[PDB]
Design a protein around this ligand. Structure first.
Ligand SMILES: CC(C)CCC[C@@H](C)[C@H]1CC[C@H]2[C@@H]3CC=C4C[C@@H](O)CC[C@]4(C)[C@H]3CC[C@]12C
Ligand SMILES: CC(C)CCC[C@@H](C)[C@H]1CC[C@H]2[C@@H]3CC=C4C[C@@H](O)CC[C@]4(C)[C@H]3CC[C@]12C
Ligand SMILES: CC(C)CCC[C@@H](C)[C@H]1CC[C@H]2[C@@H]3CC=C4C[C@@H](O)CC[C@]4(C)[C@H]3CC[C@]12C
Ligand SMILES: CCn1c(=O)c2c(nc(/C=C/c3ccc(O)c(OC)c3)n2C)n(CC)c1=O
Ligand SMILES: CCCCCCCC/C=C\CCCCCCCC(=O)OC[C@H](O)CO
Ligand SMILES: CCCCCCCC/C=C\CCCCCCCC(=O)OC[C@H](O)CO
Ligand SMILES: CCCCCCCC/C=C\CCCCCCCC(=O)OC[C@H](O)CO
Ligand SMILES: CCCCCCCC/C=C/CCCCCCCC(=O)O
Ligand SMILES: CCCCCCCC/C=C/CCCCCCCC(=O)O
Ligand SMILES: CCCCCCCC/C=C/CCCCCCCC(=O)O
Ligand SMILES: CCCCCCCC/C=C\CCCCCCCC(=O)O
Ligand SMILES: CCCCCCCC/C=C\CCCCCCCC(=O)O
Ligand SMILES: CCCCCCCC/C=C\CCCCCCCC(=O)O
Ligand SMILES: CCCCCCCC/C=C\CCCCCCCC(=O)O
Ligand SMILES: CCCCCCCC/C=C\CCCCCCCC(=O)O
Ligand SMILES: CCCCCCCC/C=C\CCCCCCCC(=O)O
Ligand SMILES: CCCCCCCC/C=C\CCCCCCCC(=O)O
Ligand SMILES: CCCCCCCC/C=C\CCCCCCCC(=O)O
Ligand SMILES: CCCCCCCC/C=C\CCCCCCCC(=O)O
Ligand SMILES: CCCCCCCC/C=C\CCCCCCCC(=O)O
Ligand SMILES: CCCCCCCC/C=C\CCCCCCCC(=O)O
Ligand SMILES: CCCCCCCC/C=C\CCCCCCCC(=O)O
Ligand SMILES: CCCCCCCC/C=C\CCCCCCCC(=O)O
Ligand SMILES: CCCCCCCC/C=C\CCCCCCCC(=O)O
Ligand SMILES: CCCCCCCC/C=C\CCCCCCCC(=O)O
Ligand code: NA
Length: 384
């Protein structure tokens, strides 16, 4: 069958993906530009991610369409159109890893996040990561390429000129570069690092949820212990456990000032052997607990849960990157590691290529379904 028929389907699908990648990610960038509630360090990496995806639509997809034709080209110019998508994929990987680390810093050390993670430092990191992405993605242009060994029969068959090759991805980009350097070192290792970071994020959240519930349970149990206490020493033991626990949750302010002060009141009576007076003073903690501590409780729990939700949203983005890019990388592994295996058929290569490009469509939908500030800003933009 004429190659232009299957090529037409592949090209049409690529162009449809390009249109969607541009539109959705321009909308992401416009939302962040317009909404100050979306202007934080996390979303600067989101914007860097959306910029890479815009460039997939504007440049990498036109480059991929071009390189599927095998047109005659100078080999190094062919290398650049082959490899520019690797720059954009690498930049996405750095942004995804930055977002994960950012969310880890926010949940592990929230008291120093604002002083540690600033807009100026984030912009500097983004710039450095773009430079590194060009270095990593265009490494074949530094000499790790197949231009020294052109396929002359294919070039002659296409009527190519002297110094030109039929411009095809696997003819110019070495597969050991793609498998060992690009896939294993530059993609697989950072994704596994991201997985580790997300594991620590969710473990940290669960531990802090446990601690909040243990501190809450300790407060209510020791009050009950005091009520059924007999000597002053038992009242003293329970209040001491409450006081240390009260200060531990103290790391709203008036409520803990009342709580500690009321614990100290009962402790002073307990040390004087006045059990009934200490027990009666301790019953007032219940008034403080209802009016302050429980509210100062579900708010921290609510905040942690919002952080879990935001961490899950970021993790879905990273996971969709892995799902969309892994088939093409896995095919490369088969090409490289199994020379006795027939090459993956051309329709599957096209499917794996277009799947990798669909990843540049999906992030705006994840933000729309999972982040209210984005969803609400999207709606206002579309209406206006
Ligand atoms: C900022 C944006 C708009 C710049 C876009 C520039 C792009 C389209 C340019 C820059 C370098 C160019 C390549 C440089 C060299 C060659 C080799 C030649 O034998 C065929 C064309 C080819 C393969 C060019 C294709 C077009 C190209 C990729
Ligand atoms: C969802 C993601 C993470 C995994 C997807 C796995 C895909 C990419 C795997 C599963 C089965 C695989 C195929 C199994 C057998 C062959 C025949 C061989 O001659 C060429 C490779 C080829 C054609 C493989 C290509 C890659 C393949 C299609
Ligand atoms: C997703 C993370 C955890 C792992 C990535 C999966 C990669 C590294 C694995 C999954 C399946 C593997 C392939 C399974 C089968 C074969 C055929 C054999 O003749 C050569 C190796 C080769 C081609 C393997 C190479 C590595 C491979 C592609
Ligand atoms: C992630 C980087 N990357 C790749 O690894 C890749 C690729 N394209 C191919 C193979 C194409 C092909 C193979 C055999 C053919 O006969 C053919 O005919 C046109 C085409 N690979 C391996 N691109 C898309 C340009 C790509 O972005
Ligand atoms: C935007 C519009 C169409 C883009 C058309 C660009 C592709 C034209 C070259 C072409 O179709 O060649 C296919 C190849 O020869 C067969 O495998
Ligand atoms: C062919 C050309 C290829 C182009 C390669 C680089 C293109 C783009 C990255 C620029 C977009 C990244 C913007 C991130 C958002 C940001 O930087 O915001 C930080 C803020 O200023 C802190 O206060
Ligand atoms: C952990 C995820 C990445 C893993 C390394 C897996 C890479 C395994 C590569 C297989 C090596 C191989 O296939 O060698 C066959 C040889 O060519 C006989 O012809
Ligand atoms: C903002 C615009 C960005 C670039 C627009 C689209 C880019 C298209 C990329 C160029 C591939 C086509 C050039 C190769 C064909 C001519 C070479 C030949 O005929 O031998
Ligand atoms: C081919 C290059 C390979 C080595 C790349 C070295 C990294 C390039 C660094 C320059 C980036 C310029 C921006 C520096 C400002 C960062 C300050 C900050 O972190 O806030
Ligand atoms: C992360 C998920 C990874 C999924 C890996 C899927 C690959 C498993 C299937 C491997 C079977 C490949 C064997 C095909 C040999 C071809 C025989 C031949 O053509 O001579
Ligand atoms: C998710 C992916 C988006 C939708 C998938 C689109 C499916 C077709 C991609 C192009 C398939 C190429 C057709 C056959 C080419 C050939 O004859 O070798
Ligand atoms: C929908 C966009 C379709 C654009 C037409 C491209 C046809 C493919 C081709 O010309 O080879
Ligand atoms: C030559 C290619 C250069 C153009 C790349 C195209 C993609 C860039 C997209 C725009 C970056 C968004 C900048 C402002 C968005 C939010 C950032 C902010 O205001 O804090
Ligand atoms: C905002 C602009 C974004 C890009 C617009 C341009 C769209 C270009 C579409 C595909 C370019 C394919 C070029 C065809 C390669 C030449 C084929 C050949 O010479 O044999
Ligand atoms: C937005 C500013 C961008 C600045 C220009 C970036 C493009 C660089 C242009 C030339 C270097 C391209 C490398 C491939 C062309 C030479 C290879 C060859 O012909 O054999
Ligand atoms: C090797 C270098 C090739 C070109 C690299 C520079 C292009 C990306 C520059 C910085 C991206 C904008 C950062 C602004 C925040
Ligand atoms: C670091 C990343 C920047 C360097 C990337 C590619 C080098 C730029 C141009 C090289 C292509 C020209 C090769 C040639 O014409 O022989
Ligand atoms: C192919 C990969 C090559 C990598 C080479 C290593 C170079 C990268 C080095 C790290 C960049 C850090 C930039 C810090 C300097 C300016 C920041 C500052 O003002 O404090
Ligand atoms: C981390 C992911 C990469 C892990 C190890 C890479 C496997 C090394 C390749 C095995 C031997 C290759 C060969 O003998 O041809
Ligand atoms: C993971 C980081 C690098 C991949 C492992 C090293 C590559 C295996 C050795 C290469 C070879 O034997 O040809
Ligand atoms: C090869 C592994 C790819 C996974 C990268 C994405 C990391 C985040 C995944 C989900 C976290 C679940 C806990
Ligand atoms: C191989 C595993 C690759 C990524 C895991 C995908 C999980 C997140 C994507 C779907 C959202 C649930
Ligand atoms: C992670 C899901 C794995 C996908 C399994 C799909 C089927 C794999 C088995 C292929 C063996 C057939 C060999 C082709 C010749
Ligand atoms: C998911 C949507 C369909 C995915 C298409 C690939 C499905 C299974 C992989 C094996 C099929 C590839 C053709 C057989 C391999 C061969 O002919 O060498
Ligand atoms: C084919 C065009 C893209 C297919 C689906 C794009 C994924 C969008 C998120 C839902
Ligand atoms: Na991306």
């Amino acid at each position: 069958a004429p190659p232009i028929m299957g090529s037409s389907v592949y090209i049409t699908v690529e162009l449809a993906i390009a249109v969607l990648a541009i539109l959705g990610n321009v909308l992401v960038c416009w939302a962040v530009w317009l909404n100050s509630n979306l202007q934080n360090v996390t979303n600067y990496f989101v914007v860097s991610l959306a910029a890479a995806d815009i460039l997939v639509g504007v440049l990498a997809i036109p480059f991929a369409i071009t390189i599927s034709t095998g047109f005659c080209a100078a080999c190094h110019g062919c290398l650049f159109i082959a490899c520019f998508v690797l720059v954009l994929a690498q930049s996405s990987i750095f942004s995804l890893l930055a977002i994960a680390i950012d969310r880890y810093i926010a949940i592990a050390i929230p008291l120093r996040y604002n002083g540690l993670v600033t807009g100026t430092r984030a912009a500097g990191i983004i710039a450095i990561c773009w430079v590194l992405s060009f270095a990593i993605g265009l490494t074949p242009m530094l000499g790790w390429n197949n231009c020294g060994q052109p396929k002359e029969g294919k070039a002659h068959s296409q009527g190519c000129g002297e110094g030109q090759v039929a411009c095809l991805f696997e003819d110019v980009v070495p597969m050991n570069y793609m498998v060992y350097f690009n896939f294993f070192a530059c993609v697989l290792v950072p994704l596994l690092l991201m997985l580790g970071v997300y594991l620590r994020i969710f473990a940290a959240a669960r531990r802090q949820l446990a601690d909040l519930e243990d501190n809450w349970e300790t407060l209510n149990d020791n009050l009950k212990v005091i009520e059924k206490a007999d000597n002053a020493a038992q009242v003293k033991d329970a209040l001491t456990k409450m006081r240390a626990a009260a200060l531990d949750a103290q790391k709203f302010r008036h409520g803990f000032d009342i709580l500690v002060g009321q614990i100290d009141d009962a402790l002073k009576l307990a040390n004087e052997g006045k059990v009934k007076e200490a027990q009666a003073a301790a019953e007032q903690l219940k008034t403080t607990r209802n009016a302050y501590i429980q509210k100062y409780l579900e708010r921290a729990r609510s905040t942690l849960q919002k952080e879990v939700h935001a961490a899950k949203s970021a993790a879905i983005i990273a996971g969709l990157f892995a799902l969309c890019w892994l088939p093409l990388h896995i095919i490369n592994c088969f090409t490289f590691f199994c020379p006795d295996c027939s090459h993956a058929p051309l329709w599957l290569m096209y499917l794996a290529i277009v799947l990798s490009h669909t990843n540049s469509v999906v992030n705006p939908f994840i933000y729309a379904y999972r982040i209210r500030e984005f969803r609400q800003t999207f709606r206002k933009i579309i209406r206006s």
